[PDB]
Design a binder for this molecule. Structure first.
Ligand SMILES: CC(C)=CCC/C(C)=C\CC/C(C)=C\COP(=O)(O)O
Ligand SMILES: CC(C)=CCC/C(C)=C\CC/C(C)=C\COP(=O)(O)O
Lengths: 205, 208
């Protein structure tokens, strides 16, 4: 009854991968076209520099994994965010992996890096201005990094909040708080959560 | 530890005491030093509801506006309307303005009433105000030009719906979110207070 075209997942940000593949594998069996993930926020730039270099160290390992395995598995990678804040090293690797995988049909992984929803909205507003378009919901929407509405917004962890992730896109997103101390989760419980989603009533106001 | 300046509330919009429970929420806000209480009455999308449903909602809203004309200023509660008010019938707009004017000076609690309101629309309207003022289009400027500039600390959903439904999206970027599965009527002061206590002890990093 409900179509899940766009699934957005965020995991706890408190000061492993299996869950991520299980994640991607399921979006696929389920015919979920867009998977959106939150890696690094605009506000995260204020963290302690140690915590940051550590996160980009992880990120870098993730991107390497993307290059190797994304194309042959027919997965696409797209980076959203204010990417200009990023070091050239990462930025290049990103650009590369996007280009390598640009032609993948089976799933689209939207990776949010140096990303914030308020920044996105501001940037989108400007895109609109510089095209000499009327400022309205529709033109703004179409000029986001990610125009696509979120259907299911999924928090893997104990934090109850959006933390500046795809706000605009979430106006009518179904929200789901899946508690854990460990960003863990099972193929089935995903499918469980999904099932739940398809059945719950969406009125879009 | 966490301070709660701005409480937002939305109840399930699908399928008396209500007035009594509301007083308790308002008393709890005062007792707790919550300066702002934000309520969701009618949204921009709600306009696509059957005409009979819209009719009934404005019928009640009217009833509530009257209560507020009666009870608000003598309790030092301020009322503010947000949303695109230009979409409202004349009789309504004026009656809103009336209670607004009458309670404009009220110090103790500020009740923000979202009527013909949508977050996306609020956001667009804020961007035009910034442009119209020849300000730079940035986060801070857009914030300050919202109908309601104040960040939401706690977003409380009363009902079974799990979603924000175009309610104060910008303000909620880092808002703590809480789903209480009950009807509004069934809520007690003790419960409001508890939920509040819970929010106060939650870890808020704002991205660190
Ligand atoms: C591995 C990698 C590149 C990034 C790790 C991202 C993870 C697992 C969580 C970060 C989530 C973000 C950006 C915000 C969530 O904020 P919160 O949990 O609500 O404080
Ligand atoms: C009594 C009165 C004047 C208005 C009542 C507002 C109520 C009870 C529900 C409407 C809430 C709104 C505007 C949106 C929530 O929609 P949803 O529950 O997410 O489908």
């Amino acid at each position: 009854m409900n179509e899940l075209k766009h699934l957005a997942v965020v995991m706890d940000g408190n000061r492993g991968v299996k869950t991520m593949q299980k994640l991607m594998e399921v979006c696929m069996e389920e015919n979920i076209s867009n998977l959106s993930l939150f890696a690094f926020s605009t506000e995260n730039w204020k963290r302690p520099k140690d915590e940051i270099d550590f996160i980009f160290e992880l990120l870098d390992r993730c991107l390497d994994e993307a290059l190797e395995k994304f194309e042959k598995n027919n997965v696409r990678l797209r980076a959203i965010g204010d990417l200009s804040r990023l070091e050239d090293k990462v930025r290049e690797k990103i650009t590369l992996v996007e280009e390598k995988t640009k032609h993948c049909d089976a799933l689209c992984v939207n990776l949010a890096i140096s990303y914030g929803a308020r920044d996105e909205i501001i940037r989108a507003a400007k895109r609109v201005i510089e095209k000499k378009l009327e400022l309205n919901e529709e033109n703004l929407t179409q000029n986001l990094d990610l125009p696509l509405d979120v259907d299911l917004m999924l928090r893997v962890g104990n934090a109850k909040r959006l933390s500046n992730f795809l706000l605009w896109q979430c106006s009518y997103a179904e929200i789901y708080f899946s508690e854990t101390l460990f960003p863990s989760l099972t193929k089935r419980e995903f499918k469980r959560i999904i099932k739940e989603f398809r059945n719950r009533e969406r009125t879009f106001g």
